[PDB]
Amino acid sequence: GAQVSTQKTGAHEIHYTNINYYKDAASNSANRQDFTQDPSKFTEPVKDVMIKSLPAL
C-alpha cells in the first residue's frame, strides 16, 4: 500500500514513494504539499460586494 506523487521541481524544465509504518496518524510526515489559499476573508470582509471599476461610494 504505497503512495506515489510528484515532487517540487522547477518550471519550464519526478516521483517519490511513501509508506506509513506506524498505526497512529500523528506519526506521519509533514503534509507540506498543500498550496490552496484564499485571502478574501481578510481583504474583502464587506457585506455588499464592491466592483473595483465602479466608484466605492
Partner: protein, 278 residues
C-alpha cells in the same frame, strides 16, 4: 492496490493599453475597511508576463515546520544538593523568545508535535581528573498532570509503569518521539483574556490554561568519583498545523515567561527629516 497515485502559480499580468473612460479603479475609500484589489495593469500600460513564482514556502505548515529550542537545563551526575542532580520542567512554550514570537502571530493553533532531545556531557574542572567511566545513560520521563513527582534521583517514581519514558545512551542519534493533539479544547490558545475564578479574581492570563504536565530527566545509575555535568536541549516541531485569527507581531521585548508585561517602545527609528532619502 500495490500503489496509488495522488502547482499553483501567482497571478499573471495581462497586456493593457491606453484608456480614457469614466471608470476610476485608482480611486477608492478605505473607510469601508476593504483593501483595494487594484493591479499595476489598471494604472499604466503593461506587457504580458507569465509568472512561474509560487507561494509554497509561505504556507503556515512550512512557516512553523522547523524545530526550535524551547528549553535547556543542566544537571550533575553526583553532588551534595539532591535537587541539583535532576531536572523538573513544567512544559510551556513561552520561555525561549524566537519560538514564542513565531507562535504568537496566531490566536489559536492545532497541530501534532515532534519532540527531539539533544544531550551532551562534560567533566567538571578540578584538581584530580584521572578516571575511567563507561558510557553514560539517561532517562526522560513525562508526567501528565496529577501524577506522582519524584523527589530524588533514586526515588521509586522512576519505575514508570504508565508514564512514557525514554532510555538513551550517549554516542547514538538524538532521541525522538511524536505526540498527538493533547488538548482539552478544540485548539490551543496562545492568549486568554480572562480570570480563573468565576468572581473575576485569581490568576489572569494564559498561565491559567497551561496544564500540560512536567518532564523529568536523570542519569540512570551513573555516579562518578568526580562530578560530571550534562545539558539537555528540547526541540519542538509542529506538524499538520492549522491556525486561526492572525494578530500583529509583537514589538516590545519580552520580560516575563508567564505574562504579557512590557515597557513602552518607540514605533520605529528616526531620520533627519521627512524629505531625507540618502
Amino acid at each position: 492496490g500495490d500503489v496509488e497515485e495522488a502547482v499553483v502559480h501567482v497571478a499573471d499580468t495581462m497586456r493593457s493599453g491606453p484608456s480614457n473612460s469614466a471608470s476610476v479603479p485608482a480611486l477608492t475609500a478605505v473607510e469601508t475597511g476593504h483593501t483595494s484589489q487594484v493591479t499595476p495593469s489598471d494604472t499604466m500600460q503593461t506587457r504580458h508576463v507569465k509568472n512561474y513564482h509560487s507561494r509554497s514556502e509561505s504556507t503556515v505548515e512550512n512557516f512553523l515546520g522547523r524545530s526550535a529550542c524551547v528549553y535547556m537545563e543542566e544537571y550533575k551526575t553526583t553532588d551534595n544538593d539532591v535537587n541539583k542532580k535532576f531536572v523538573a520542567w513544567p512544559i510551556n512554550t513561552k520561555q525561549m523568545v524566537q519560538m514564542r514570537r513565531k507562535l504568537e502571530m496566531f490566536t489559536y493553533l492545532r497541530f501534532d508535535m515532534e519532540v527531539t532531545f539533544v544531550i551532551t556531557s562534560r567533566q567538571d574542572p578540578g584538581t584530580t581528573l584521572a578516571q575511567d567511566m563507561p558510557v553514560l545513560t539517561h532517562q526522560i520521563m513525562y508526567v501528565p498532570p496529577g501524577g506522582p513527582i519524584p523527589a530524588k534521583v533514586d526515588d521509586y517514581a522512576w519505575q514508570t509503569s504508565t508514564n512514557p519514558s525514554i532510555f538513551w545512551t550517549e554516542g547514538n542519534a538524538p532521541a525522538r518521539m511524536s505526540i498527538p493533539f493533547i488538548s482539552i479544547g478544540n485548539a490551543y490558545s496562545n492568549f486568554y483574556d480572562g480570570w480563573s475564578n468565576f468572581d473575576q479574581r485569581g490568576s489572569y492570563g494564559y498561565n491559567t490554561l497551561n496544564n500540560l504536565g512536567h518532564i523529568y530527566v536523570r542519569h540512570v545509575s551513573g555516579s562518578s568519583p568526580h562530578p560530571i555535568t550534562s545539558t539537555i536541549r528540547v526541540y519542538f516541531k509542529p506538524k499538520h498545523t492549522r491556525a486561526w485569527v492572525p494578530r500583529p507581531p509583537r514589538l516590545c521585548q519580552y520580560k516575563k515567561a508567564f505574562s504579557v508585561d512590557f515597557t513602552p517602545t518607540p514605533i520605529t527609528d528616526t531620520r533627519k527629516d521627512i524629505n531625507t532619502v540618502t
